Design a protein around this ligand. Sequence first.
Ligand SMILES: *[C@@H]1OC[C@@H](O)[C@@H](O)[C@H]1O
Lengths: 18, 350
Amino acid sequence: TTYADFIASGRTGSRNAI
Amino acid sequence: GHMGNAAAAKKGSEQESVKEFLAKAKEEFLKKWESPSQNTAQLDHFDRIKTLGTGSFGRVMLVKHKETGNHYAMKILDKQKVVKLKQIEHTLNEKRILQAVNFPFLVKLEFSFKDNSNLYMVMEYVPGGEMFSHLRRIGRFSEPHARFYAAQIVLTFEYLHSLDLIYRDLKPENLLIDQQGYIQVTDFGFAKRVKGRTWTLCGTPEYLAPEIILSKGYNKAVDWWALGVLIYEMAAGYPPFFADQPIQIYEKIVSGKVRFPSHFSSDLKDLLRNLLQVDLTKRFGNLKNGVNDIKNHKWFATTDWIAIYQRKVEAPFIPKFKGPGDTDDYEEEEIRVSINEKCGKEFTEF
Ligand SMILES: *[C@@H]1OC[C@@H](O)[C@@H](O)[C@H]1O
């Protein structure tokens, strides 16, 4: 599912600017 | 037509009032922009309570004013580190913007000063922490809850853009929720006052507009794209474009395809397709009618823009109240002030 994909992405925590 | 005479006249009058407000706001901003405040407190006016974070050239400390007892979030920047990291212009610009703006949903710079070693920005302290943690905890916001926060961003961008300020770092991580449940925008480190196009590659991958990625020059419309991303993430619990690595995210952003949870309303999907629009000639916020295409969209039909501005709407969520002394944990380090002035010329304007 999309939600599972989001968890698997490793990008569920605070995101740094580039 | 869609509107009878009374509705049409009401909308006309509302839009003229926005114009008058923005004209006054610009005159106030420009006075402070052209003559910034400097040196409005000093370090020994404050007791240090707790280090709340650290960065490559600075940190944030919870402090208390010794006489009033008010708590603040004090950013301490090491001048030498700022120079070494080539962040002079950004540091000066962030403070100059903060001392010049005034809006109910923007974090306020209450004092600033410098000494031999450091620059200090003494900010309003919002103990309820940021939207990011609340969103990840709750999972997602219902559409009315998301709409209440979105409306505050729309008005904030209407204000900032009228001053030719592009914000360029919208994300839940930069949005605090105060004790009345209203938004406070923080971190103007990437904001820029420019009237036309600009080119810097800056922002956060999930929130970048396609024209930033594509190495086009770009304008204030990147903030309206980012609003689309924010609304989507608030309402879904995850953003519209994600992947393991930023390059894969960028592919999705430029592709022109977005998919929506089945629980999104038709009105929400329509608004988001018009904000997450790769074609700049079609993106809401970037057309002849400006911000009004957003404010007058069906998804905002229940929104009383003035009541939001006046903070009279009942918030959907009040963060748990703790006490400004209450407060992740960090190691405490001294505030060393050298007996010799460092980098004085570089920071004269601060
Ligand atoms: C992003 O940083 C990590 C965590 O503190 C989260 O709540 C965000 O502030």
